[PDB]
């Protein structure tokens, strides 16, 4: 999965 | 002393007393104070200020406009010789600030190894950041904050003084964290509340199916059982007897001073 | 090569290979890398870092402590020769960061012309910013984000990876944008939701009464009709046959990958 | 002229015309423009840009990467010779920006004395900051904002154009202030709403028990009585006849242009 | 109308 | 009491 550190999430 | 294999740009200012390791690189317009130690292979790209009693490890990359070891923002601080320690292989991005400790807070700001500190991340006096963490753009740790291993703090998130961000935690962007976040938890909002277990993080870091289930069960004890923390502590300790990953909760409970986010 | 009419401050470092246009100005303590092209009349005030494979247009004004073309923050990036393109007449303010692309994201971060990038705005790897945009203080575009012409992104707003901010959009301050924002829309909150049409923006930019009404009608189809997007797409295309300004919705729908904010 | 007792680092650039006071310190890689006045004992640590028609008082400490007196971000500004005034004993931290006024806004950005402006605080054109204020990390004052004495603005808080933050106000972190905040009030949220009186602040600053009670009574008139502001104004003025601390409300009402937060 | 980019609004 | 300027509070 893609990490989006700015959003603070692992993308679903 | 400056190692013979270190590079110091002619425009850089390295003050007498600074210790610069082998194959380190001090780029243009950097300032390195006399109480600074910079480890082997560490790179200061350009326009970096490092001062105070500050020890930086090996293979770090520190980008332009970062301020490391600087006087902290605590109104109580009065110039005492407090310290910064930074480990190995950190990527410390543009405009990051890492401030020295206060005597009142223990005298030390500490950052581990293999961290990514994104643009304008702030590590205030007396913080302790572990290993393999990510602080996203404008992430701000107020004084005395602990961020444990593998934790990820989202963009524009502020962690309030004295709070603990547990290991493998995911804090969503633009959050305000006012209490302690147990390990393995997803936290979001202002003030931040819990939104389950960071399952994907645990998967990526090699946690077994059994460990993840046990962690989820511990989460449920804390947040779903309807019991108080004092009631569930021995139940979690009981669970940790079989699944050692659950011991992280126990160790965290012992350190927690501000209560848990709920 | 450096044009004979360019000014390069004695304290600036312009590396051999850099191309500096006529009447450009490289201020004190700037660093310009060997793969950089700076267009005619562009000004770097002071303390600016420009590196990577980076092409900057004409009549830009780049303020102190900006970092342009720098290594991006993607953990996947490994030093590949990716690119930045910046157009003409941009005002790029203190501490703005514009990072190079990743191979995985297409190799290019692009910014158009006549933009205002306010203090500490961040343009991550693989973003595309159009023309006449405003990114307010601390506005943060995560990787792979598109911001279309005339869009305004409020202070401390974060746009999540892969999202599209449509043309003439107004994003309120301290927003977190997690999905795509259709053109002409006012968006606010965390996560951001729609709050009608940016009527004032359309007025100021010369849109007719008929065009604005049609745009409002399209907005109502998307958000008020109670139909799914697949149902309303041909209705919007139908409407665009009379009012060409409505075609912006169609073109946006074709690019949208994260669904619409609602 | 540069006072004989001032220190100007060899790498600093102080332009002819600048006035540098006794025992001032201009650190490495600073730039001081020809219309700048820097008062006795003021320190620019390093990498500081000060320009424009800018007067800075005594015993200030200005940290690296700060930009003081710079061209503002107002699209209406066209290069007019507007001004910045900064008082005494301010601590102005890394990456703080303080911009010159606009003709349209009165020509002046003003900051008083004994303020702490934390990392990346922003003071836009035409703002007026009083004395003994704190702007926390990333606190952002939009154009034409007033911050009165002793006010504290939390991390990542934005104050919208023209708003007044009253004396002794506490604004919580990550707030968005869209209207005027009466003196003595705690404000939080987006948009910010009132959460009672800043009792602890009043205690610490020597307010009597009687004064605090009167202030609480005035707060109740505004927010609890259910009356309109026009109704309660004379009641507050009446109360101020006995407790002069309450006059702060009256003086604030006279300046308020955006209505009160509610 | 007045643009407030930090607020992200056209002022009413 | 402890001032937390980033939180914007006097700590209870």
Residue numbers in the entry:
A (entry chain A), E (entry chain A), F (entry chain A): 1 to 12
B (entry chain X), C (entry chain X), D (entry chain X): 1 to 262
Question: What's the publication's text?
Answer:
UDP-N-acetylglucosamine acyltransferase (LpxA) catalyzes the first step of lipid A biosynthesis. LpxA catalyzes the transfer of an R-3-hydroxymyristoyl chain from ACP to the 3-OH glucosamine group of UDP-GlcNAc. The crystal structure of LpxA reveals a homotrimer that possesses a left-handed parallel β-helix.
Here we report the successful crystallization of E. coli LpxA complexed with peptide CR20 (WMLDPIAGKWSR) at a resolution of 1.60 Å. Peptide CR20 is a potent inhibitor of E. coli LpxA with an IC50 of ~50 nM. There is a single LpxA molecule in the asymmetric unit, and three asymmetric units associate around a crystallographic three-fold axis to form the homotrimer of LpxA. LpxA-bound peptide CR20 is folded into a β-hairpin conformation. The hairpin inserts into the active site of LpxA and the N and C termini of the peptide is solvent exposed. Peptide CR20 does not disrupt any contacts between the individual monomers of LpxA, but instead forms a bridge between the adjacent subunits. Residues of LpxA involved in direct hydrogen bonds with the peptide are Q161 (backbone N) and R258 from one protomer and G155, G173, and M170 from the adjacent protomer. Residues that interact with peptide CR20 via water-mediated interactions are R204, R205, N198, and Q161 (side chain) from the blue chain and H160 from the pink chain. The most efficacious peptide CR20 binds in a region that would mainly occlude the binding site of acyl-ACP.
